[PDB]
């Protein structure tokens, strides 16, 4: 594992009461991130468990200290995050004095070149905006299938590579408020009103910040950060999330009537999913698997697929995947399908072509 | 740094939808701005951008809270002004809510007596004008030094320091306009038409106003403060600013014939100056750091420089520069030299001396 | 707050080179006002202060823009008119672009029927001109008491809404000579002789006329509204406002013989309050509030109170002031008693009643 011996700081790329952000390489394409007060004695277990949460994304843990029992349990009740192109890549983490220039936690990360809203300050090519929405999809989709929830997906935090500034690739990070427990995945008890229920902002889902607490009154993340999703595609494709600004809509009360149509350039198949996306009812909301499948599909299917026509068969399907996986062996959309025949199971890509027929 | 627990509120000096300004002090001489809705659930990021642009001058940042990553891009994006004189004195900038007594962005500056309008309601002495006039001059030679356009420069926004009446303080101030980007410096993209331009107003120059936009296509604000200088010249002397007022100069169409003759009481090189200033072609018009000399060396050379005569020697500058330093070791005259004397470069005092030498 | 987005215009009402007022209607009974040029680069301070001062009355402010020193200033030293059924209703003002169909000021207001000149084109009963005199009495009752004075008061500027035209109710409008500063009051400095005194017209008193100037050298403005009044309350009387005319009395001349004689129909106590009114000397002029109460207590008093005879009590005051506020609970009738009622302080209503004793 990669510790502060093996790497070189320079400029603080952030400073705060709370922590400080270096720029750093390996002897300056690293962010080296350090959170203070990472102690039982300093500060309560509702921040250390927030400091912690931020390390679900992490490849390689290293501790030089004897663990502290607090730290034994924040360990063994969460749910790790495997790699993947639309996750923060955090290389290392450790714990560490504040010398080597306060135990602190590190986190050692990839330096990206911005954000999505400073991305969007010029609009992209509605091509591009397309594959940002797909590459979103598939990080919530990626998250779900391993139960965890981000709770605070924004603009703000979605991260670009922006090397070939037509197509750029998104990572999803900052997960310091994330569900990521073995215990009851992305179903919470909800008992008591002053409880932890993720950024208590305004892309919190309809059925999170709607719910009353109770005995079991449950709250249930399983499709939260999908809505959230939905009104970022606003700001992807150009216009204001409707759930920002000071006439704005509000998670709780929005009745779908009251959502912008989007601009025409954006196609019709797409403002469907948007649509679904943003239903309060999250019953009514796909899947992310397979919402996820629906961008992919509009994509790279055969265009006979999307036009109304049709006759789709579960060996042409597994054709059309060995197609494209041949075909990946322009590294966005290498990424984005590779990162769809991951996860493509038969019975979704079919309900995900299913949806699509449905909506023209 | 000082934060709100270390001073003291009074009564309000501005009230606003968008903010307020209340006197303070530690523990009535600093002012203490406030800005609502730093946020950006509650605001976009031009008017963000907007808010932020005004702590372009400050001299310590602090911040309470985690840093999101468009405060982080906005501050990594920024230009810094140094202190200096003649520009505002910006205390400290913090973020905080609207208890303490709305995420809010916080200024503490010094409370200046009156703006440059109220002072010329009654005529000044023709010295007095000099030094307020070579002070501006020198406040824009700072800006256009370290990659700053104030772009909404005015009578309006500059402050005075009025004890020692007979000779006042200017300071340029609200930097809410400014251009101040290490990636782009003075020189600004413009290919939409809908696009920040600075303030949309009666002193942009003609070099601004009358630039269509295209692809590359390059805004060029490098000599831009200096055209707003050379109208407000004229309010500095006792005239209208020939750019205001219902029969009115337009900077699009104005041709350099219909600008007003100057009273005789302004010597005739400074005269020549402002009409430099107001020069149309930013290419006719002097450097920044040239036309702060030009008034300088008016101010304090030997007499036998200004009178046509001259024999001018490398080696009698320095000794002249010099003799200044030991004159400095009327507080605005001591700053003015002191001014001029760390921004002295041999090439450019020559370069000014020049200039008055073939304009008489 | 309203803004134009609100609002939807029909016909021009009036046109000028200055401004335009609109017809108007929330989605015609509203009128917008609209100011040209509502900026220092566009014209002068005492413009300025002139549109600025037509916005005293004014219910809610709103600012699309960040305001400038020069409007700040203005907010800050000015005295604010709450709300009061004779005083003209400004529902908003706003500063916006002339787009939307030059910054320009805006004034949503009510629409009034017409003014006091046409209607008193035709006589009307002797009854309705004392209600028109205790409307007007009771407006310029509410400006004393809030510090502020109007100073051009005419038949061309009372409004009226002329439902029931038995009985309609009359407001004081067009505030942009009026006196409303926080700092000095109803007492002004008087220095220069070229200094904003009012309209500088036919109704200007007695006591700001004459005044010659010096170092206080103080205009005092505490009764001058009165007088006017006394002018206008021979128009509303079926006569000629002594003042106006080719053969006509100055305010500055007048010896107080000179004044014509009221007709017969007009109660002999209330052509004593208007010669009192019309008093050179404003030391010998009933308060604002004690003149509002004779023409109340001369509409409303128990006629015991009126006839010479006269036992009054403290006590029985009180009940006969609770009479009314049960009788209230001939809309204009309803208006006055609650407008007399609001104010009625105990102290006062005898001073009036004991003013109406003495004049018979
Ligand atoms: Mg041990
Ligand atoms: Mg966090
Ligand atoms: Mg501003």
Redesign the pocket.
């Known amino acids: 594992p990669i510790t502060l011996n093996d790497l070189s700081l320079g400029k603080p790329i952030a400073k705060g009461t709370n922590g400080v952000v270096y720029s750093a390489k390996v002897k300056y394409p690293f962010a080296l991130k350090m959170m203070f007060n990472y102690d039982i004695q300093e500060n309560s277990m509702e921040i250390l468990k927030?400091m912690y949460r931020?390390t679900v994304p992490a490849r390689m843990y290293y501790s030089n200290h004897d663990l502290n029992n607090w730290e034994i349990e924040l360990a063994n009740r969460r749910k790790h995050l495997p790699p993947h192109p639309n996750i923060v890549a955090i290389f290392s983490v450790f714990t560490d004095l504040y010398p080597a220039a306060n135990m602190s936690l590190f986190l050692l990360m990839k330096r990206y070149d911005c954000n999505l809203q400073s991305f969007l300050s010029t609009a992209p090519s509605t091509r591009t905006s397309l594959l940002l929405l797909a590459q979103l999809l598939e990080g919530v989709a990626h998250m779900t299938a391993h139960g965890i929830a981000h709770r605070?997906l924004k603009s703000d935090n979605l991260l670009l590579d922006t090397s070939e500034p037509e197509s750029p690739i998104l990572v999803i990070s900052?997960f310091?408020?994330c569900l990521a427990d073995k215990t009851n995945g992305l179903s919470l008890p909800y008992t008591s009103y002053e409880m932890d229920k993720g950024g208590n902002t305004a892309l919190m889902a309809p059925e999170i910040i709607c719910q009353k607490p109770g005995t079991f009154s449950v709250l249930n993340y399983s499709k939260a950060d999908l809505w959230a999703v939905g009104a970022i595609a606003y700001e992807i494709f150009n216009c204001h999330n409707p759930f920002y600004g000071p006439s704005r809509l509000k998670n709780f009360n929005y009745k779908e009537g009251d959502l912008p149509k989007l601009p025409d350039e954006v196609p019709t198949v797409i403002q469907a999913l948007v649509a679904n996306l943003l239903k309060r009812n999250p019953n009514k909301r796909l899947d992310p698997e397979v919402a996820a499948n629906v961008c992919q599909l509009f994509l790279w299917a055969p265009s006979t697929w999307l036009k109304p026509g049709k006759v789709p068969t579960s060996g042409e399907i597994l054709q059309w995947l060995l197609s494209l996986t041949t075909k990946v062996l322009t590294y966005p959309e290498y990424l984005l399908i590779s990162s769809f025949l991951c996860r493509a199971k038969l019975a979704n890509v079919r309900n995900a072509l299913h949806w699509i027929q449905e909506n023209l």
Chains 1, 2, 3 share one sequence.
Do not use: W
């Open positions: 927030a931020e605070d900052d310091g408020c």
